[PDB]
Each structure stands twice: as C-alpha cells, then as structure tokens.
Amino acid sequence: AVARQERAIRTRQTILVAAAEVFDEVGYEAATISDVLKRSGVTKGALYFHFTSKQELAQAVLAEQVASLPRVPEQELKLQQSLDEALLLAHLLREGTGDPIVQGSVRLTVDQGSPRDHLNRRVPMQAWTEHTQSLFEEARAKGEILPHADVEALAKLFVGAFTGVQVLSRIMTGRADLAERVADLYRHLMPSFAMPGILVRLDFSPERGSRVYEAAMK
C-alpha cells in the first residue's frame, strides 16, 4: 500500500512530463496516446489508471503549469521575488531541463484550438493571475507598492505581457533572448507602481538569475 502510492506519484509525473513533451512537439490535435506511451515507456494500463483520455491528460498538463515552477527561496523583497520567478521561468522555457512540463503546458495554453476541443486554457492563466496578485498583495503589505495601485489590473498586465514577450521571443530567436526580454519588461513596468526605494534595490542581472537557477535545482 505505501509502496503502491509512491509508484502512483512517480508514474503520474512520468506520464505528465512525456505528455507535455509530445504536446510541445506536435500540438494537441496531432498528439496521440500512443505517442505518450512511446515517450514515457509506461504501460497502457498505467496511463489509464491516471488519465481517462487525451483531453483530460491535456487538461492536467495545463493545470500543473504554475505548480511546475521550482519555488524560489523566500526573501527580503516580494518584488525581487516576482522578478526572480519571471527570470527563472524564462530560463526554464528556453532550456526545458529544469522543468520539462512548462514548455508543453505553455504551448497548450497559447495555441488557440477551438471550443470543440473542450480544453480549459483559462485554468493556468487564472492561476498565474492569482499567483502574481498574491505576490503584489504581499509586496503592498511590506510597503513595496505605491498607494492606489490596482493589484488585480497589475497582475493581469504582468501575466499577459509575460505571455507575449515569451511568444515574440519564441518566434524571433527561439527564446534565446527571452531572459533579456523579460528583464526589459520588468524594468519598464516596475517604475509605474514600485516604491522608488524598492526600485533601486531590484537586481535584474543574469548573474543573480544564474544563482537563483542553481539554487532552485535542489
């Protein structure tokens, strides 16, 4: 029983990682259960214990998007935390290795599909919006945000802007410039709402990005 549940945990992750990969490579519609079976090396029995259909598997990779980012060390500035997360996500989307679910999950999110596929792409977008607003809320309690800033509007701006920065970067450089583009984004958004005292202390450097990455990989 104890061993059965440990196997169940590991098997689900194995499926999710393999499924995200095939969804990344070929998209939702062209992907098959067979592709995922070939990639994971799990049995057909194992896959159906965890997921009911391709659709429900796709939904799960969508739903695990936010939970996929390694949690950054809890720190002094909440807006530095947001920057650290965004730059880590930029690294994870270019490299893939540190989190093999995100690339595929983002592709499923951003591909339009149709109402016919019954995928709920709002799921990860809502979760990122909540994630981001929550961090702004904590930043505001810690005196990091200007008075009368709309933290919901701001959260929606950050999620949307990040998404499109990602898209443009994917198209133009295959995400090679993504960390630089994300840094640029944060440098031009933060001045509208971050307390000036916080703004001078924020660290946008690839060296800090590198250290956060090295830390998150344990």
Place this chain on the structure above:
Amino acid sequence: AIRTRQTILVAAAEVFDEVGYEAATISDVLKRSGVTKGALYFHFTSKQELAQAVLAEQVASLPRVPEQELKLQQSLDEALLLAHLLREGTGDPIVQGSVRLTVDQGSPRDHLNRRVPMQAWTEHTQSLFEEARAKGEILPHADVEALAKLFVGAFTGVQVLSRIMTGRADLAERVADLYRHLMPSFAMPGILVRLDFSPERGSRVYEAAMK
C-alpha cells in the same frame, strides 16, 4: 483580379481563424470566398502559399490612423484600433486569422514563417518611437529598438490573455493599461498627461481610419 485575390485572402484568414492551419482546406476557402477553382489557382498554388500571404498582409491590413504630431498618441491610437479590430473583426477581416497563424506554434514541417509579421510590427513601432524620441516625447537616448520589441511582445500577450479570459471583451482596457503602465519608464515630462485613452477618441479614430 486584385480584388479577387483579397476576397480569397479574407476567406482564407477566416477559415484559418475558425479551424486553424492544419485542419483548414482549399475546399473550405473556396466555399467561403465563393470564387471558382480557376480564380483561386491563378493566385495561389497551395494552402501553404495562402497562409504565407495572410501572414505577410498583417501589418498592411491595419487601417492607417490619422497622422498626429504627438507620436506616442499615434501609437496609442493604433494599439486601441488593433484591439478593436481583433475583438470584432469587421473593419479588418484579415487580422484575426493572421494573428492565429502568427501565435499558434504549428511545427517547422508546416513551412510557415511567423517571423514575417512580427518583424514588420517591430520595424513599424520602432519608426514611430524614433519620431517620438526626436520630437522630445521620450528620453533622448531611449533604446528605441528594445522598446519596439517590448511593445510588440507585450501587446501580443495582452491580446492572448484577453482572448482566453474574455474572448477579447476586455482587450481595449487591457491595452490601455499596458500603455499607461509602460510609459512612465521612458516618457518625457508632461507627455503622459497629454495622452488620450478615452473610448470616445477611439471611436473617432476608428471612423476616420475607415474613411
């Protein structure tokens, strides 16, 4: 014949919007455009060539906003116009489908070059920011290329989020938020206050652009 090429282009874009590139067919396009097989094949050899042309026509499809002395306003006018056109469709029936073709990842096997509209938007936005900079609307040494990339990128994402969350119902608000929040990082003194974000202005811009 040029108008027949456009009728086909509009129909192809709408078909690409509805069902995507892979699922779409010449037969869908012919049904939608109501042109003969001969008319289509004179202008395009394949679905692939059709897709490349609606991708290519993206920037040019955007109706020209009236020239403005405040160049930042001109950009805002364009941004809010494009928001409006992406939400409704009727004033630029090409753009919805062209955007889906740009944003959908597809595969390197499809021979579609998504770089073409993105490069064109970047050069367009860069030119405006050069004019803005020279007229003293933005910081004299602002990296106008990086800003263009930032604006094209951020707009695309705001668009994508709005489509997913509201079907683009909130797009104009979200684009306004984008411009309002990016501007203080690089605008010259007294410029941000001069900008007009109102939907009444947006409406006047829309009308003039169609005329």
